[PDB]
Design a protein around this motif. Structure first.
Motif, short mmCIF file in Angstrom:
data_model
loop_
_atom_site.label_atom_id
_atom_site.label_comp_id
_atom_site.label_asym_id
_atom_site.label_seq_id
_atom_site.Cartn_x
_atom_site.Cartn_y
_atom_site.Cartn_z
N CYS A 1 0.84 -1.20 0.00
CA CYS A 1 0.00 0.00 0.00
C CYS A 1 0.87 1.24 0.00
CB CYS A 1 -0.91 0.03 1.23
SG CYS A 1 -2.22 -1.15 1.16
N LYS A 2 1.99 1.12 0.70
CA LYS A 2 3.00 2.16 0.78
C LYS A 2 4.07 1.85 -0.27
CE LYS A 2 5.56 4.50 4.50
NZ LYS A 2 5.98 4.40 5.92
N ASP A 3 3.93 2.43 -1.46
CA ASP A 3 4.85 2.11 -2.55
C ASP A 3 5.99 3.11 -2.58
OD1 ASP A 3 6.21 1.31 -4.86
OD2 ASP A 3 4.37 0.77 -5.93
N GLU A 4 7.12 2.71 -2.01
CA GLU A 4 8.31 3.53 -2.01
C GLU A 4 9.27 3.07 -3.10
OE1 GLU A 4 8.38 2.56 2.24
OE2 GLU A 4 9.05 4.65 2.51
N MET A 5 8.74 2.27 -4.03
CA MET A 5 9.48 1.82 -5.21
C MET A 5 10.73 1.01 -4.85
SD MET A 5 9.20 5.28 -7.52
CE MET A 5 7.61 6.01 -7.85
N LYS A 6 10.74 0.42 -3.66
CA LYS A 6 11.82 -0.48 -3.29
C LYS A 6 11.67 -1.81 -4.04
CE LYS A 6 12.10 1.50 1.40
NZ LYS A 6 11.64 1.34 2.81
N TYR A 7 10.44 -2.19 -4.34
CA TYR A 7 10.16 -3.45 -5.04
C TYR A 7 9.33 -3.21 -6.29
CZ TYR A 7 11.61 -5.00 -0.42
OH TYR A 7 12.29 -5.18 0.77
N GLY A 8 9.20 -4.22 -7.14
CA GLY A 8 8.49 -4.04 -8.40
C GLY A 8 9.45 -3.61 -9.49
N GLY A 9 9.06 -2.62 -10.29
CA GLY A 9 9.91 -2.13 -11.36
C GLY A 9 10.45 -0.74 -11.10
N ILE B 1 1.05 -8.65 -17.81
CA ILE B 1 2.05 -7.61 -17.55
C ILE B 1 2.26 -6.89 -18.87
CG2 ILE B 1 4.40 -7.08 -16.79
CD1 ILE B 1 2.70 -8.33 -14.56
N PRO B 2 2.27 -5.55 -18.86
CA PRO B 2 2.45 -4.84 -20.14
C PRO B 2 3.77 -5.23 -20.80
CG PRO B 2 1.74 -3.33 -18.42
CD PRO B 2 2.10 -4.62 -17.73
N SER B 3 3.77 -5.27 -22.13
CA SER B 3 4.96 -5.58 -22.89
C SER B 3 6.08 -4.60 -22.52
CB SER B 3 4.67 -5.52 -24.39
OG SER B 3 5.79 -5.94 -25.14
N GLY B 4 7.25 -5.12 -22.21
CA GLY B 4 8.40 -4.28 -21.90
C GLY B 4 8.47 -3.88 -20.43
N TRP B 5 7.46 -4.25 -19.66
CA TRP B 5 7.47 -3.95 -18.24
C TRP B 5 8.19 -5.07 -17.48
CZ3 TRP B 5 6.62 -5.42 -13.31
CH2 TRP B 5 6.41 -4.43 -12.33
N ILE C 1 8.97 -10.53 -12.35
CA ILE C 1 7.67 -10.10 -12.86
C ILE C 1 7.84 -9.56 -14.27
CG2 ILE C 1 5.61 -8.73 -12.43
CD1 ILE C 1 6.89 -8.15 -9.59
N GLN C 2 7.28 -10.27 -15.24
CA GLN C 2 7.38 -9.87 -16.65
C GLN C 2 6.31 -10.63 -17.42
OE1 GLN C 2 11.43 -11.43 -17.81
NE2 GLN C 2 10.23 -12.91 -18.99
N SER C 3 6.10 -10.26 -18.68
CA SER C 3 5.18 -11.01 -19.54
C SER C 3 5.55 -12.49 -19.52
CB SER C 3 5.21 -10.47 -20.97
OG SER C 3 4.76 -9.12 -21.02
#
Ligand SMILES: [Ca+2]
Length: 634
Positions: A194-202, A562-566, A576-578
């Motif tokens: 919920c708290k997205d500090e962009m430490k994880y994901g893309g 997952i969007p192409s290129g993400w 996490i990818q297509s």
């Protein structure tokens, strides 16, 4: 001192309560947070068993309220509120006051469309699109001396299973899953903090999976489940009734519930505060009030800088309504909220909710899905002949369709239990025919095996047709139909159903009408037999449960859009990818002790058999016992 009933149903409650609080059974985390279930391997609304929901917190309050009623001990009920406020109502580090204080009620949020498939996300922000005014914010701010929101977030990663809280922590983490509209099933989500500090994901954390913008900043977002917060009010009222009889002061807990009920008024509102009916137009305040309990309100804002936003929801499901809660907040002295307009608003919602149930009642008696102020979640024009309720269009399956959100009979019992308790408490004549017709349909669809002392209730419902447009009175809706397509031993729901039938029967007890006496006997006997058979046949070590089959576990391998290129990564390093699947971004599932069993069954094409003890289910069963035992001191 109060005289507490001594009968077997009271004792059944106490034995269930003891099982739920037995440390051997593991219903609770170290913090005292109720898990979704004892078991870990399960995918439902939460996608892991030791996540939990705000529903569980309010069921925990309700369970403790019933125990306090029967024992005069309120320490457990206080404990339930204490952990709620500490761990599921976002605090200062969760919703920074500086961001909340920079809210603009004239510009509550920026419009983005919802879409009929996850592959159409992220959804572009439209800065030119109409957004209405928030008429609650100033009143709430003046009343509570803060801009922060006192409501429960709906989903909690109790032991940090996803690892968004870091690699060496089991402290609870606020998380979200569902984000990408009506066709995003539980199998098709990407979990996010919920708290997205962009430490994880893309690159931009998880933000640009869902929202299209030219730049992204660290931010928080919380999403309320209005039926959970309403149940908290319902539970606390039951506790306060008991407290007054036992001579115990829980006034500060009453105050917590009325504050939560005060903020819960956001569930009355269209997603972007659009006028109800003429939804292309920005509202100017209460003209955007739908006056039902919508599917959510949500709020967010900046972490690295100071800004915030709020939305309601244009979608309404009968299964979320709670007239008992609305009556409590509008029609009792103890639970009048502190905001000057709150009681009046809640009185208006009470009225609207009872009409909503009537409008949705099928020819057979089951309650149909609901209604929306936003066709397709993007304010699309309604097709000619769309049936409406105060300008909102009928939706057989509100909010989600995989599976249909009104396929599960559980919503019937959960929601109509509230109508029944409300009718018992208020004796509102507008609820009677509604309940009469619903109870007849429900009791006609309980299958008893008296020799085995077992039963089945409806599991899956199929809907056709549509109600008459609401003009002020029920029509019978002869072109709106529900069929039971499958039955099952759904014990948690059976508990809720017994609860509903008990309050309905008790409410009928004062009738001298001959037909009411027959309905009384049917409802009361059906409720009692459910309880007797639950007790006789379905007990195990941890509570009351039975094997169930999950034939959809093949969807562990469900592809996730997952969007192409993400590209991005989960905290544990899952890519996490297509081409990713539900399982490939949740590889810790393969570390679960029940995993080999699952992949064994899938490998040779079998369904998967599981026995679950869900916290809400065990609670519903326990509370059903206590309910019958206190209403019928026979
Ligand atoms: Ca924990």
């Amino acid at each position: 001192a109060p005289v507490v009933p001594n009968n077997e149903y009271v004792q059944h409650f106490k034995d269930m309560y003891a099982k739920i609080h037995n440390a051997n059974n593991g219903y609770f985390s170290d913090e005292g947070i109720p898990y979704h279930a004892v078991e870990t391997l399960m995918v439902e609304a939460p996608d892991y068993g030791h996540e939990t929901t705000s529903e569980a917190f309010s069921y925990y309050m309700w369970l403790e309220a019933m125990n306090a009623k029967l024992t005069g001990d309120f320490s457990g009920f206080k404990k339930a509120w204490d952990v709620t406020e500490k761990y599921i109502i976002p605090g200062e580090t969760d919703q920074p006051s500086a961001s909340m204080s920079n809210y603009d009620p004239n510009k509550p949020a920026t419009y983005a469309a919802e879409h009929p498939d996850p592959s159409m996300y992220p959804s572009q922000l439209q800065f030119g699109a109409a957004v209405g005014k928030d008429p609650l914010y100033n009143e709430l701010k003046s009343t509570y001396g803060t801009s922060q929101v006192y409501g429960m977030h709906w989903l909690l990663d109790v032991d940090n299973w996803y690892g968004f809280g870091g690699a060496t922590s089991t402290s609870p983490v606020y998380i979200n899953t569902f984000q990408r509209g009506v066709q995003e099933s539980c199998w098709e989500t990407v979990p996010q903090p919920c708290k997205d500090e962009m430490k994880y994901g893309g690159r931009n954390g998880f933000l640009d999976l869902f929202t299209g913008d030219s730049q992204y900043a660290t931010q928080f977002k919380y999403t309320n489940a209005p039926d959970a917060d309403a149940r908290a009010v319902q539970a606390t009222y039951y506790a306060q009734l008991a407290a007054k009889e036992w001579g115990v002061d829980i006034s500060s807990y009453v105050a917590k519930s009325t504050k939560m009920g005060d903020f819960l008024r956001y569930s009355f509102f269209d997603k972007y505060f659009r006028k109800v009916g003429n939804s292309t137009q920005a509202g100017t305040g209460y003209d955007s009030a739908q006056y039902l309990l919508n599917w959510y309100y949500a709020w967010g804002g900046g972490i690295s800088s100071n800004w915030s936003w709020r939305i309601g929801s244009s979608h309404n499901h009968f299964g979320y309504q709670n007239p008992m809660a609305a009556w409590i907040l509008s029609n009792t002295s103890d639970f009048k909220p502190k905001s000057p307009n709150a009681a009046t608003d809640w009185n208006n919602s009470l009225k609207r909710q009872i009409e909503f149930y009537q409008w949705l009642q099928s020819a057979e008696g089951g309650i149909a899905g609901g209604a929306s102020n936003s066709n397709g979640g993007s304010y699309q024009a309604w097709p000619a002949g769309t049936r409406t309720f105060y300008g909102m269009g009928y939706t057989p399956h509100p909010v989600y369709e995989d599976p249909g959100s009104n396929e599960w009979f559980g919503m019937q019992a959960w929601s109509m239990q509230r109508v029944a308790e409300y009718y018992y408490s208020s004796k509102d004549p507008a609820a009677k025919s509604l309940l009469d017709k619903w109870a007849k349909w429900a009791c006609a669809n309980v299958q008893f095996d008296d020799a085995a002392k077992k039963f089945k209730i409806p599991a899956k419902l199929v809907w056709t047709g549509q109600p008459d447009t609401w003009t002020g009175s029920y029509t019978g809706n002869s072109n709106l139909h529900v069929k039971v397509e499958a039955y099952g031993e759904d014990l948690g729901v059976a508990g809720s159903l017994s609860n509903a039938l008990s309050y309905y029967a008790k409410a009928l007890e004062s009738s001298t009408d001959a037909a009411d006496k027959v309905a009384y006997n049917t409802a009361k006997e059906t409720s009692r037999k459910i309880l007797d058979y639950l007790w006789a046949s379905y007990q195990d070590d941890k509570g009351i449960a039975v094997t169930e089959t999950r034939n959809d576990f093949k969807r562990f391998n469900q592809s996730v859009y997952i969007p192409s290129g993400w590209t991005g990564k989960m905290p544990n390093g899952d890519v996490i990818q297509s081409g990713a699947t539900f399982l490939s971004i949740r590889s810790k599932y393969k570390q679960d002790p029940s995993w080999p069993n699952v992949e064994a069954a899938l490998a040779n094409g079998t369904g998967v058999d599981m026995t679950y003890h869900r916290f809400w289910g065990q609670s519903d069963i326990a509370i059903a016992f206590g309910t019958y035992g206190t209403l019928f001191t026979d």
